[PDB]
Design a protein around this ligand. Structure first.
Ligand SMILES: [Mg+2]
Ligand SMILES: [Mg+2]
Ligand SMILES: [Mg+2]
Ligand SMILES: [Mg+2]
Ligand SMILES: [Mg+2]
Ligand SMILES: [Mg+2]
Ligand SMILES: [Mg+2]
Ligand SMILES: [Mg+2]
Ligand SMILES: [Mg+2]
Ligand SMILES: [Mg+2]
Ligand SMILES: [Mg+2]
Ligand SMILES: [Mg+2]
Ligand SMILES: [Mg+2]
Ligand SMILES: [Mg+2]
Ligand SMILES: [Mg+2]
Ligand SMILES: [Mg+2]
Ligand SMILES: [Mg+2]
Ligand SMILES: [Mg+2]
Ligand SMILES: [Mg+2]
Ligand SMILES: [Mg+2]
Ligand SMILES: [Mg+2]
Ligand SMILES: [Mg+2]
Ligand SMILES: [Mg+2]
Ligand SMILES: [Mg+2]
Ligand SMILES: [Mg+2]
Ligand SMILES: [Mg+2]
Ligand SMILES: [Mg+2]
Ligand SMILES: [Mg+2]
Lengths: 201, 127, 176, 97, 46, 122
RNA sequence: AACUAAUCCUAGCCCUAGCCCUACACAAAUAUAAUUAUACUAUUAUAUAAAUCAAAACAUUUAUCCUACUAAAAGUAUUGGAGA
RNA sequence: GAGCUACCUAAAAACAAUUUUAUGAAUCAACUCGUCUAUGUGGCAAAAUAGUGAGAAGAUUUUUAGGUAGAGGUGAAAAGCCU
RNA sequence: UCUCCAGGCAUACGCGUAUAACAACUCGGAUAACCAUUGUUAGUUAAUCAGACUAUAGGCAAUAAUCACACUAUAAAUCACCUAUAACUUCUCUGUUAACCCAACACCGGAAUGCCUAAAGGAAAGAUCCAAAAAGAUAAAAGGAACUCGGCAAACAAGAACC
């Protein structure tokens, strides 16, 4: 829908259903377009806050909402709200982050922490690598835990999960036969009757 | 199989065989009270009672004695915020009676298993 | 037996059930036709059990445990279907060169539009079939006016769309 | 009557943008250019009213002559109906005879 | 007598008088369908 | 006062109006008003034996997925037919007339499973 | 000392310029009481547009409607109950 | 646009009891119609209700499907009827 | 449990979830209770009841119905059986709920057929008071059309004659 507004809460969640009802017709939010190639901030990076209440500090990127050009920093751009409030109990005060726009932060050079601008470039294999304009160096892609919470290395197969070796076994022998033809041959079914002529039109 | 063409049959033709099946069914708890042998199913609208017999006997190795079916009309009375009717889909219900005196009953899924005297003044103060 | 329509009795009542990843297309391609034929039914029985549990949860008004399991199975079955289709598609091209399994043609209907017509199977040739002959694949001259009106109506919609895009760019450039 | 309860956002106008700075240039193309081009040829607009002016009835008839054969059915039906209405007003009605 | 009840419903009559096959039977009826398609009607016929 | 927008089904109308819900026919009606089922018209499920099968619905998260390469007519031809022709051509025992030797089929008539027009379902 | 109310800016739209088009949208279903997997029973626009209206009525007649390059020759030659 | 109404075509249906006879006869229900009076008048109802009245084996009444269309159709002629 | 009222049950046509349980108490019922309202879950099972249901070519018909006998009458009146050809064992599909339809409405209206007439189905009064005027019913001394345009209406009458 044209009137959908992207927000902090995940799309499809209970809160998102409440904020975006089918009958909501609020004004659009104007967003500068950034090409998929040009985007250079990814979760797990370290950035520097150029301006704001928390200007000068550095933090880790924990979320990125591409639609709004948003980047969320852990423990920064913070306000206070009670969580778990009920009819009787107050709740427990916590610190809540607020999103920052992409132009409000800069990437930090890993070797010596300092703001640096970067340019995309191709390596020998051609795979794109971020390169710092000043003191040219490659900023490696950070590693981030999976959203679903699965850890592949620690994962242990259950009763209904195929083993890795079994999954990669190759049994296909290319041949000019349909799946139907092969199954009948293997299973031993024998049929000799043939369809009469049919007119297609 | 559904949403597919069947070869036209004429005198002396082969047997019709479907190697991969497109029909998916679900077992439901009876709303009313039914005999011990009977079981209920929800099946696609294109399935026949003959198909259900072969489906259970061959895929699931279950002996079947009889089958009956009905079509249930889905409601078209509720309206959306623009006052347009919402349609609940029509579906098909099947009743299957087991053979050889066998009995079945639906399993039990989801088995489970401040100080009144000083009012309004924060206790934090030690003075 | 009927016990296969339900999960392992131990799991009943549990809040979560661990599951792996769904089959990707590339992994399936390595497997043979006979293996895929068997793999279909293994997935099928898992699908029926998951559909059964989903309906029962609604009846009891409780959340379905680990609902993401259903989506994985449905994705896996779709990938199996296309992989088999890819093999058939290539084989048909080599032996016949046709790009579609079902015969058809391009024809004009009585309203003046051009539509693809899919053929049906018949026991007799077309010129002897009186029910088929009543169907008309031509347009008479009173339809020409409506053909022009459709073309012009489509032209208005396109002009408004391009005009709107240009105006939106003006706002963006001003803002940034 | 009801009035705004707040001031509208300010309007800022740049008086030295390219369009404003160079307005009028080449309006003397003929007299200073040996009369190879007439200033009317510098005008941009609809094909049927470049370097020409008329009343509404004249404008309607002139539009039909230039692009009448390239028009949509419904637009042409409305143009023809406007002409006949204007014809009867300008030739049969009014204070002065 | 009291008026206001002239509609005595009958499905066989309704489909024969205003139905799809009836509209296509004559060129005038075919043009009825074309007008409703150009307007964009969701219901072309009974 | 009739509803023009809802679907026309057999639950509606008088007794004499009936139509199907999309199930395929399995037999024929004769005169004398008797239904006669045909056995070959009833679909038969071909179910394989699943004893000793190693594959299961789900896969491990540690299994590497592969780069996607959809199969094409060129790829199938090279893997299956190209090697045999190459060897025969070197020996010189190749001619256009005997392409059937390598698996070519001139026409689909006579085959139980015809590739065009398709005469079998999924 | 406030209820009922009121304040708002962008969703889109309008007129031109430019340009022919090649958009003809998974599976399945539909001309049968459309959207019902197979035989019954054949299938096919239109002879000249009229009237309102102007002529202060009305009867011959009445620009556009009923399109063929702009500017001029020119509201000129011609036609008309020689009158609109 | 003939699902109301006017007339027609095809296939169907209903008519108790009593007296006469042997019937467009009689008394009077069902059913069809609508004489007279009061109430009602934004009414229960854009023509009704309460009583009282006419016919009731026939030119009777009723159901289902089909036909005739406005320069026209239909009419036991009221210039009636055709949503 | 008591007091009183007296068209009910099925089928056809039509309608299209109004059906049943739970939960809500906003909107709907012209008010409450309770739901006919809102949300969620459920439901109607057929080779016999009902619908649809494609072998071919020839040959041939004097004699109604009504208890059909008697009996007449007039309006003159519901495929079978034979001759040849061909086939040579079968059950799938669809309808099935309800306090319901046409009348702007939970409208004192209109609505076909079979069985039956209370064994089926129902409730005229929210509470109180006992004025005028208005509407409907019943009773009335003596007189009996003197009323009125007119015996209109009513009556313990419901009859006769003439133009
Ligand atoms: Mg109406
Ligand atoms: Mg005049
Ligand atoms: Mg009629
Ligand atoms: Mg009628
Ligand atoms: Mg009688
Ligand atoms: Mg009358
Ligand atoms: Mg009399
Ligand atoms: Mg009488
Ligand atoms: Mg009589
Ligand atoms: Mg007269
Ligand atoms: Mg008169
Ligand atoms: Mg009218
Ligand atoms: Mg209820
Ligand atoms: Mg309740
Ligand atoms: Mg309800
Ligand atoms: Mg049934
Ligand atoms: Mg039967
Ligand atoms: Mg037939
Ligand atoms: Mg019933
Ligand atoms: Mg009314
Ligand atoms: Mg009322
Ligand atoms: Mg009772
Ligand atoms: Mg009282
Ligand atoms: Mg009295
Ligand atoms: Mg007295
Ligand atoms: Mg007197
Ligand atoms: Mg007097
Ligand atoms: Mg009287």
């Amino acid at each position: 829908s044209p009137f959908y507004r992207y927000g902090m809460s995940r799309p499809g969640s209970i809160a998102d259903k409440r904020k975006n009802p089918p009958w909501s017709r609020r004004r659009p939010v104007v967003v500068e377009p950034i090409s998929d190639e040009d985007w250079h901030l990814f979760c797990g990076d370290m950035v520097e806050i150029l301006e704001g209440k928390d200007a000068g500090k550095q933090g880790k990127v924990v979320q990125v909402v591409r639609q709004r050009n948003w980047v969320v920093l852990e423990g920064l751009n913070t306000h206070y709200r009670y969580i778990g409030r009920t009819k009787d109990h107050r709740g427990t005060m916590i610190a809540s982050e607020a999103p920052l726009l992409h132009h409000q932060v800069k990437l930090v050079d890993p070797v010596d922490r300092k703001p640096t601008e970067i340019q995309w470039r191709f390596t020998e294999a051609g795979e794109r690598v971020r390169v710092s304009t000043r003191s040219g160096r490659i900023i490696p892609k950070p590693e981030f835990p999976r959203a679903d919470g699965i850890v592949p290395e620690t994962w242990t197969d259950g009763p209904k999960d195929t083993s890795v070796e079994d999954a990669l076994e190759r049994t296909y022998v290319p041949r000019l036969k349909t799946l139907e033809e092969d199954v009948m041959e293997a299973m031993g079914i024998q049929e000799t009757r043939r369809f009469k002529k049919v007119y297609w039109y | 199989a559904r949403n597919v063409l069947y070869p036209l049959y004429q005198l002396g033709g082969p047997q019709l065989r479907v190697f991969r099946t497109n029909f998916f069914i679900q077992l439901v708890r009876p709303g009313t009270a039914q005999p011990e042998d009977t079981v209920q199913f929800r099946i696609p609208m294109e399935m026949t009672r003959v198909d259900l017999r072969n489906y259970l006997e061959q895929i699931y190795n279950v002996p079947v004695a009889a089958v009956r079916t009905r079509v249930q009309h889905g409601s078209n009375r509720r309206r959306d915020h623009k006052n347009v009717r919402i349609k609940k889909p029509d579906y098909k219900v099947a009743y299957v009676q087991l053979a050889h005196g066998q009995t079945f009953t639906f399993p039990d899924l989801f088995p489970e298993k401040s100080d009144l005297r000083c009012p309004g003044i924060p206790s934090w103060f030690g003075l | 037996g009927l016990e296969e329509f339900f999960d392992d009795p131990k799991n009943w009542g549990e809040e979560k059930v661990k599951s792996g990843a769904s089959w990707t297309c590339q992994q399936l391609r390595n497997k043979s036709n006979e293996d895929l034929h068997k793999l279909w039914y293994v997935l099928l029985k898992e699908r029926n059990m998951l559909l059964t549990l989903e309906q029962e949860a609604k009846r009891q008004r409780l959340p379905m445990p680990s609902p993401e399991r259903l989506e994985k199975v449905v994705d896996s079955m779709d990938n199996v279907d296309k992989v088999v289709q890819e093999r058939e598609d290539a084989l048909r091209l080599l032996q016949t060169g046709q790009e579609k399994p079902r015969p058809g043609a391009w024809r004009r209907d009585i309203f003046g539009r051009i539509v693809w017509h899919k053929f049906k199977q018949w026991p007799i040739p077309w010129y002897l079939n009186k029910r088929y002959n009543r169907r008309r694949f031509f347009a008479m001259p009173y339809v020409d006016r409506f053909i022009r009106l459709r073309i012009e109506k489509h032209a208005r919609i396109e002009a408004r769309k391009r005009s709107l895009q240009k105006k939106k760019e003006k706002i963006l450039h001003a803002k940034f | 009557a009801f009035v705004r309860l707040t001031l509208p956002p300010p309007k800022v106008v740049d008086r030295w943008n390219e369009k404003r700075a160079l307005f009028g240039v080449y309006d003397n193309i003929g007299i200073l250019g040996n009369f190879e081009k007439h200033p009317k040829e510098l005008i941009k607009g609809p094909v049927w009213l470049r370097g020409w002016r008329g009343n509404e009835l004249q404008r309607c008839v002139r539009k039909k002559k230039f692009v009448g054969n390239r028009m949509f059915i419904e637009d042409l039906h409305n143009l023809n109906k406007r002409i006949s209405y204007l014809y009867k007003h300008f030739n049969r009605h009014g204070k002065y005879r | 007598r009291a008026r206001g009840n002239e509609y005595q419903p009958s499905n066989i009559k309704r489909k024969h008088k205003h139905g799809w096959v009836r509209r296509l039977s004559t060129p005038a009826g075919v043009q009825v369908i074309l007008r409703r398609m150009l307007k964009g009607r969701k219901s072309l016929s009974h | 006062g009739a509803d023009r927008m809802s679907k026309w089904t057999s639950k509606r109308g008088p007794r004499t109006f009936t139509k199907s819900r999309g199930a395929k026919k399995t037999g024929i009606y004769t005169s004398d008003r008797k239904f006669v089922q045909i056995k070959e018209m009833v679909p038969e499920f071909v179910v394989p034996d699943l004893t000793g099968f190693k594959l299961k619905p789900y896969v491990n998260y540690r299994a590497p997925a592969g780069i996607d390469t959809p199969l094409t007519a060129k790829a199938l031809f090279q893997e299956t037919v190209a090697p045999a022709i190459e060897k025969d051509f070197k020996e010189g025992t190749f001619d256009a007339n005997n392409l059937e030797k390598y698996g070519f089929e001139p026409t689909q008539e006579g085959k139980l499973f015809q590739l065009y027009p398709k005469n079998f379902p999924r």
